[PDB]
Structures are given as structure tokens and as C-alpha cells.
Write a protein that binds this ligand. Structure first.
Ligand SMILES: NCCc1c[nH]c2ccccc12
Ligand SMILES: [Ca+2]
Length: 223
């Protein structure tokens, strides 16, 4: 997260870290046994890390649980990043508490101008590289479809939205991928793609979770 703030430990209880020997992606806990992330985050050998703040230190609130299965969306296209969503099932159910908690799925899609919280352990520089150990947060508005389409001609599908600032300086970034965009207590987005981080006129692009609720529910119900 570029231009954000330190969230504070365990203040974003649904935020998970996906670890394959190192943190590679974020995710959102949506029930005791399932995580939602980006399809571009797919790999084998994932351990889900819940209750994290400093990802490099064991601070006492973590649960580390291996993934038993991953389900990439059937229509994901890695080239266009259309349908950039994936479910991860835990080998065992997390123990839910104040510091490890699920986030509700949307009942309706959020509008342009809604204020959201974006979070992650990704790069904090738009040109350099610096990775934070503690969770970073950004408050950002959803942008109009028209402005998003204008920013990225020919690339924005019905399954994506922009959030952020056209002026630059505040954005999600590398390593934030798969992480949450929560608006009014609902998961509305997943960190998906952008052109660089925090560049003028290149806001971040997010998977539109509201479009996937039926798939997520049905998938969970049968897996
Ligand atoms: N807005 C951040 C989108 C993003 C995800 N992974 C990345 C890697 C490099 C640059 C941007 C990104
Ligand atoms: Ca830790």
C-alpha cells in the first residue's frame, strides 16, 4: 500500500496472508474455512496465515492453517485478468474471535463514491521497493465506471472497478494482490491489477465481488 497508514495490529481481522515460504498475496476470510483471493494469486503449497500484523514475527494471535484446496474461477482469463477471483479452503476451521473474523459478502454492488478500506503487506513505494512488515491500510473511494474506462481504455470489464485517486500518490501495490476492499462492512473488491502503483491517472483496479456471490455461495456449499 502506497501512501497509506499503519492499520494497527489485528484491526482488520478478516485480512489474511497467503504464505508459500514467504508472503506472496493477500486474502479475505469469509467464513471459518474459506478465503477469497485473486486468481492471479494461484499456486500450490499455500498456508493461510490469520491473525497477522507483523508477518515476520510471531506475536501471539496468529493461526497458521494449510490450504486443502484452491478453486480458481472457471472463467478466469490470466491475460485480461477478467474474473480475477479464487477460493481457498482451509484444512481445518479457523477459531473465530475479535482478532480473527470473517467479512460479509455483499448483498448489493457498491457505487462510485463509496468509501472503502484497502489493506495489505505490499510495497509502500511507487518507484522504489520497500516492504512493510506490519499491515498497511488505505481509505479510498470507488471511482465511476466512466473514469475507470477512461484511465484504462479497452481493459475494464463488467467484473472490475477502479478505486483510488486520479491524482496519484495513494494506491494498492505489489504484494497487496488478492487482498480486500471493504466498504461499509462488506467485501466489495479484491486487489487485482493496475499500471504501476500510485501513478497519476492510473488508479488501482479491483475485482467486482458482488458479481461473484452466487458462485462463491454455491461453491462453498458443495466443497
Ligand atoms: N494497484 C495495485 C495493483 C497491482 C497488483 N499487483 C501488482 C504488481 C505490480 C504493480 C501493480 C500491481
Ligand atoms: Ca506475525
Amino acid at each position: 500500500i502506497v501512501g497509506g497508514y499503519t492499520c494497527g495490529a489485528n484491526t482488520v481481522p478478516y485480512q489474511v496472508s497467503l504464505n508459500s515460504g514467504y508472503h506472496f498475496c493477500g486474502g479475505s476470510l469469509i467464513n471459518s474455512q474459506w478465503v477469497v483471493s485473486a486468481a492471479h494469486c494461484y499456486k500450490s503449497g499455500i498456508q493461510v496465515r490469520l491473525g497477522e500484523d507483523n508477518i515476520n514475527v510471531v506475536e501471539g494471535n496468529e493461526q497458521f492453517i494449510s490450504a486443502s484446496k484452491s478453486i480458481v474461477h472457471p472463467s478466469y482469463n490470466s491475460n485480461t485478468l477478467n474474473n480475477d477471483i479464487m477460493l481457498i479452503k482451509l484444512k481445518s476451521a479457523a477459531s473465530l474471535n475479535s482478532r480473527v473474523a470473517s467479512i460479509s459478502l455483499p448483498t448489493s454492488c457498491a457505487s462510485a463514491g463509496t468509501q472503502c478500506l484497502i489493506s495489505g503487506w505490499g510495497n509502500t513505494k511507487s518507484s522504489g521497493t520497500s516492504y512493510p512488515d506490519v499491515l498497511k491500510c488505505l481509505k479510498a473511494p470507488i471511482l465511476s465506471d466512466s473514469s475507470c474506462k477512461s484511465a484504462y481504455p479497452g481493459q475494464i470489464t463488467s467484473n472490475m472497478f477502479c478505486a483510488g485517486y486520479l491524482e496519484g500518490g495513494k494506491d494498492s501495490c505489489q504484494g497487496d494482490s488478492g487482498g480486500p476492499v471493504v466498504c461499509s462492512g462488506k467485501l466489495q473488491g479484491i486487489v487485482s491489477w493496475g499500471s504501476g502503483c500510485a501513478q497519476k491517472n492510473k488508479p488501482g483496479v479491483y475485482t467486482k465481488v458482488c458479481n461473484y456471490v452466487s458462485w462463491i455461495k454455491q461453491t462453498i456449499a458443495s466443497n
